[model samples]
Target: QTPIFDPTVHWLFTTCGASGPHGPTQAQCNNAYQNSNLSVEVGSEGPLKGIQIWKVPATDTYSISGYGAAGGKGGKNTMMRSHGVSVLGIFNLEKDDMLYILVGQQGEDACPSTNQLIQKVCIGENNVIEEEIRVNRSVHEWAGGGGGGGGATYVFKMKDGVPVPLIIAAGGGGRAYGAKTDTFHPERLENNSSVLGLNGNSGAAGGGGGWNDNTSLLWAGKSLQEGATGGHSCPQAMKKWGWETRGGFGGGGGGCSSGGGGGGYIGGNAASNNDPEMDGEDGVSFISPLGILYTPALKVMEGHGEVNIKHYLNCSHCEVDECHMDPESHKVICFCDHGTVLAEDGVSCIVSP
Candidate 1:
């Protein structure tokens, strides 16, 4: 087959098992299985077994897959299992083609009671197919496996037919613990003492920290110009107790009065009392090479908040057989293709084909 080219677009794939808490389940290694989404019948085997493939316009084909196992339980219990896989192939791409892949998780109650597992997978291709994969594992003697982290965003810049890599950021991990009140500050402080409230802290403060950028490309942009800053957590003075108590805001953290901090645009809220737990908003996804090729509005698509999966999944263009592109007009729209929703009077719109 001739290599085809297609602009990279957001793609989502998820799977759940019959056993456990609607997610990953345990299974023996090399165990083979198939589902509505995954067809193990044809030329399907190897790590790619049980994987679903979505076709795009790339002349060449690429492969990407990820797996997350459940955490181990009590003593003598096997450690929770986790695994991920990826393969990249690049070729020619047309302007208007679309492709994506979805991997379903193990079903509920369909596994060894003593040893259960769950897993999800995603795959894709573009003008220059790039692969990104990650895996995490933890043990929960009493509780089930922790939630998985968000997936990363991939951006490609093409020059003279060859693809120039631009940006790639892994998604933040999911919250393992639910919300809870902080007894650390029993005495609530008054508004006057609120300024001394908990200093804002980054999302990853809990078991899993927030995402960080190591790429020089991120540093090149104007400082503070990237996505929203993670929220903060401050210490409020409890006049009654004469001690400082932690107060969270924007990102996840302990709240002052009630409710834990809420999730932020680029980060999650801190854990707090009242079983307060906030989810990290999806980070913005954009394709800005040298930060100036596309309009400012297009560049802005990088830091928008979490997207709505229901809308994207139901949209006509999203489904196979009949597809179309979502439309918008503005100087810049930060998050496109991803599940993020546009603000009513906002400049950005979800784009798909």
Candidate 2:
């Protein structure tokens, strides 16, 4: 029987008001916030419901900044002179047999201050990765892109003899300072890997690439899949010495000529090379027919006087060695380098079953 539901309007909620150096602007807290909530349906059509809520305390203030993190242009910078509160929430929705969520944040200004960082808050749902039926294709790595989120691991579960609900995730981008650059490689979605990202300038770091499969091969022989392109490395000038350092190319070695490079051999092609200093975090795998059926919950709290905060729920942190195999049995399993047992039997593994 088809379910009767409108996934869009399911997660609506009333504003809970604001607190802090910035009180909710009457219009911002009430009218503007409500309007923003309703406007969330612009890109979606489905039933929705709010799942997570957050409140910015009155004592703390947030800095307004641009979007340089994801290679986007930066925005204006401003701060509130007084204290205020911000309210935000996350929602989950379903539409066209798919699921998605919206997250909103609103800020109230208690005093008319310069460069006010006050913004609007709205209700929404979480972004949901839909389930799908796929085949066990060749094994490959998806390069975490530069300045974008990290690469993710996806495992298929057999349901009625077909792989379904493949888990998917993206990785966090590398951090840069001064003239330094960090590039990432393309990531593997199913198996095939020829995806590539645009190469940035010498001093600018490039982005990681993406990947997916086009064939059905449950087991393909050992093949050396190419690693995602690494980010570029730029130079950092020493103010005291007044010396200028050259930047390195993306995904290569770094030296006095350039700054730090990205993508090491551990997660890429080789296992001993080093340049992209930090290895990508390993993706996680969960057994199908999971004993835990209900969705998990998450919360966050800033230590005394901390202003900025972030949170994640029902999501596994991405890793580099998520999909590996046992030496003796050769069964697929999750590989936690930190000495975590991945599986016990070929049929019942810790990560994939």
Candidate 3:
């Protein structure tokens, strides 16, 4: 996959030693960010993940890799999500297939930009278009919430038979171990992030501190225990209430070193960051009727950019068999091998002879 940014896009990737001979030929320039109110191609890590790119084209499938910047790990915890590694994925695509993509990660020396960046896409001749978008950011300071659930792109094109599989991963939290070497997100870390083992879950911030929860990919972790102050994982009451539309007031992170405080998909709060704690940057995910894969990190409880997908269908193609989700979450749409079709009550195949 190539790249194509929006130009006005902020934050690009970072290449550790890219300065000059004083450096190491840029140490080969890893996931360096560049930004643009201009154009984009493929995507990168968070911090380095905040840019959007479109279809540059590909012969077949490909892989994506890169690490956003780390927050400056120290004190009690070590490899918390803050000090997270970049997540990577592999996927395939076809031709004439116009692909639309959006991506975002955390930031370091990078400029501040939109978290809920969304756009409608079209495929082959006509395609499903996402009609709305919303995004917001707040601070709770849980040693910084997991990084933005970004650095992802959807792959779709049922215009054929078995469409290629796509993989999406959000940039991990920030300011942790420079980078980790775990890149095994087969289905994009959906099984569990504790397997931060590969790259499925969000990470850092809370790890090294204690056994904070935010270590994996979906949620943020915790930190230190400055009972005099606090620890990292400040588990809070994470549920939606009335009037309240988005975000959860994560539990208070333990005292001491600015660590994990609580949680919030809108973002989280760290102990030291002051004001609204660490930001648990927003995530993305939505299954288009056409199989456009957005991402898996859609952890928004309530807020803009937050989305929900429900299906109601009746096979207009032909008769029906049933709308059984073959494997469950994986196969949402049903198929008709014997040329069948289901009814609008997609729950079961319309038994029309």
Candidate 4:
């Protein structure tokens, strides 16, 4: 949360992490994202899923941003909606050099389908169905089972130790099995010279990628096929099937009965029979393959997913004649010569009473 820049020109900020039954630990993510954010839940494998290195202090110019995670909503009959994406860049470092961050997560919402905890979350899959529909004759059901996608926001660079990747912010696609009407997607960037990731609008499913990706998009529902850890399980033939589908890590799978996908870099696909609606797909955003200075990822409509880093110094890094140039926002202003009169952290230079 806490975004839109200006945290006093923040040096770093992160969001989306939760553990121990739902997060807010790590000394409250360093008493609220200053000691360098933390909250948990981002790792799917190991080797430290609590990533967030960042260490560079001096040598000027820095601005890196990301925001993703928003997808999950569609139950009770279906309304579904999603939106999340944003990535900005600007760099120049030298002091210690090191950066790595991953802040994403938001996709997981669906449960009903006759409850009983959906039979303890439909253990071995079966998917679930119902479809008696009807507007006034009552009934109206699919109950609930679809929502899980958002999660993709990173910025890494390590190489020898592995972790290469510069920027990416794409996550949004979750909320499937609709078809009563209402639905929305969002999270594009189809090509900035061949950057693709937009395909999750059939029921829900798609979003997750961030490497070098080239392919990864699926959509079918009556059986299964959208794996690689994008959430699976569902197929015993439908109709109160099982319940084990809801992903976010290459997302896609609402299996409990359709709709799920979204987790970018090249991952978006999942949707089922709506015969009338069908929606889901949104994910893909990145930069850095020997080029960065980006600024075209945009989307960010709802919540969850954030990361920011800032530190500017302009004026040719100041201090040679002080500085100048600001004829109304032309920026770069820093002066303090002649008896001196600029301190209070405004680029030093005291003694002017």
Candidate 5:
């Protein structure tokens, strides 16, 4: 289910709307803001680029939620494409602490059903790791442009000038050119609840990558996984424009327009064009070690990625190592961190006896 934002109650962060011949345009920004129920703000200019920064106003516990971006539209064109993953958590933060909210962008669409390159070159770009590379369309132009993989929605805590990942919602893999078959189709309709990122297709055509597997370059894995040719990871740094790539923060899609991988703690990988088996991989979702109440969407999320932070006001904030909402009352609940127990005062945590 999509989360609605009321600016008075929540701090909403989103992606810049459609890009013009050069870059983000005011006309596009206006449309996006209108749909989002908010006014246009400058995540469109320089320095920060599309990244949004939120500093802790006062030392207190806050609620944080993240939703990843959706993959690009496949040339096949289905009204029912897949969306990104989501996660929620609460944190006890101090004053002066800062959080960087990177709301993922929708990947670029393929050449479309036209069966020819739309611009003679596909541009799958990102705001954080800004790069404008041209795809080679000389050979397989008829294959149509492969949709770019969606960007991952991320929230990073700044400690000593270093950004530590707090919670991550992964983007979905882009769809490829093909008809819906029993094996593939990222509608999240597969029968695997325990599986984190289900494969778009299984069997001979291969499957989307997942947490426990990194067997092939085509599989999703820890940190970041580049597409087949240069399958490497770029941790704590900007992603490179590798051959048939995946974005760093969130994995990008591959070349020859195979589906792009989804980005996350572990990214999903795209399929190969070897046979008829070419589908995008699904991004994996994550929660920090201190994060609680982890929930993967009951179904897939489509459209742009989002990040929301709602701070509790009024009641005196709880003092504890960790905090969460009480399922019964929807009020703040407090607890101690690992190896500690609540003291008699009910407000203090003490080392285990």
Candidate 6:
């Protein structure tokens, strides 16, 4: 499917906000024009939005990446803190200039929340990994940062327009305890903000009283989460850093007799790998020079945070296969590859008639 773009498998991963994924609205590219080079261009009047590219070949460059929307648990944040905060750069085009790729929908979590590459992919109530792919911002800045936006997906540039920061990742707040025994205290209220880069992990310590803390009503799971997601620019430095998003992490206050729960901006802060529905960990997958044969260009993945202005072309676009069967059913009933080799359940194949 080469010539420039094709394999998108699936991204626009949901959590409400009308399902978040309106790439070409505002009249759908306003009378658009293209032969098929597919660079970008759209929008046409206040709130009309925009994106344009018609030949910048001034040395070559156009690599981008992003992820956000993972934060939401409840009361006393027992575990849950990681909701996508990634953003890679490199555009370098200016030959009469004209741009638009502002797509960031799915609101509620301040810093100007409401779409800027979105924020909505959370899961908690115990956690087992729903969408928070750990991009390494220092492993969620444990303790000192009180567990919110870790590190290790570093790759910054395009300063003067969006650089001047030290706030690093953020989006965490709410914790409590000590009303009928046990004794524990930790809390934060504010000092977190950033929109286009999404952030708000700074607040925890204030539990027990209302039955100490009712685990923020069952950690607000069920698509009820959002917070801790900032850092993403490129596409004209995100409109010159006009604040993209921030303020979507809250829930923690309980401990009258057993306090536990809170931390997850769209859900995650959970703990466990045994799987049952704990939904924890994930939110970080950027490192796209568009190299890895471009099958989807992934060294890490969880694309739910969304964004794909891809490049590279080869490998015929994977459908995934590697069957050899007969080694004793090789773990039993593996789906038959390609053509009519059978085994959609009608029977078997790969060697078994």
Q: Evaluate all candidate structures by whole-model CA lDDT and list the values in order.
A: 0.21, 0.19, 0.23, 0.47, 0.45, 0.23
Local distance difference test, candidate 4: 0.47
Candidate 3 vs candidate 5: which has greater lDDT? 5
Cα lDDT of model 5 by residue, 270-335, tens digit: 654412125566666666544444344322456766777665322235432234333333344355
Candidate 2 regions with alpha-carbon error over 4 angstroms: 1-3, 10-33, 36-184, 187-353
Q: Which window of 10 residues has the lowest lDDT sum in candidate 5?
A: 228-237
Q: Name the candidate, 1 or 4, with the larger lDDT value.
A: 4
Write down the worst ten-residue block by lDDT for model 4. 219-228
Please report how far candidate 3 places residue 117 from its true position, in Å. 35
**Which regions of candidate 3 fall more than 4 Å away from where they truly are?**
1-51, 56-59, 66-81, 98-103, 107-165, 174-188, 191-353
Instruction: Give the number of the best model, judged by lDDT.
Output: 4
Question: Stretches of candidate 1 above 4 Å error?
Answer: 1-148, 153-173, 180-212, 215-279, 287-353
Clash count for candidate 6 is 101
Q: Estimate each model's TM-score.
A: 0.24, 0.20, 0.27, 0.35, 0.57, 0.22
Using alpha carbons, what is the TM-score of model 2?
0.20
> Could you tell me the TM-score of candidate 6?
0.22
RMSD of each: 19.4, 23.0, 20.2, 15.6, 11.4, 19.6
lDDT at 342, model 3: 50
**Candidate 6 C-alpha lDDT tens digits along 1-353:** 32222334221211112111122333343333223334443333332222122233332223344333233222123433323343433232334433223322221221112433221211123211112213421111111111111111111222334322111111122111111212211221111223122111111211101100123322121111111112221122124322121112222211111111222222223222111122223221223222221122121212123333332122223222122122222121234443425455566654435
Per-residue alpha-carbon lDDT of candidate 2 for residues 1-353, written as tens digits (9 for 90 to 100): 11221122222322223211111233432453464433222111111122112222222111110000011100111211101111121112112222111111111111121321211100102101000001212101111111211211111223354323222222222222111223333421221112222111122222222222110111000100121212221222122221211111112211111111211111112111112222222111111221111222111211001111112111133221133323344233433333345544533334332
Q: After superposing candidate 4, which stretches have Cα over 4 Å from the reference?
A: 1-10, 19-27, 31-64, 70-84, 89-105, 109-139, 148-171, 175-277, 280-294, 298-304, 312-353
Give the 10-residue window scoring lowest on summed lDDT in candidate 6: 205-214
- Candidates in descending TM-score order: 5, 4, 3, 1, 6, 2
Q: What is the clash count for each candidate, in the order shown?
A: 81, 70, 107, 33, 8, 101
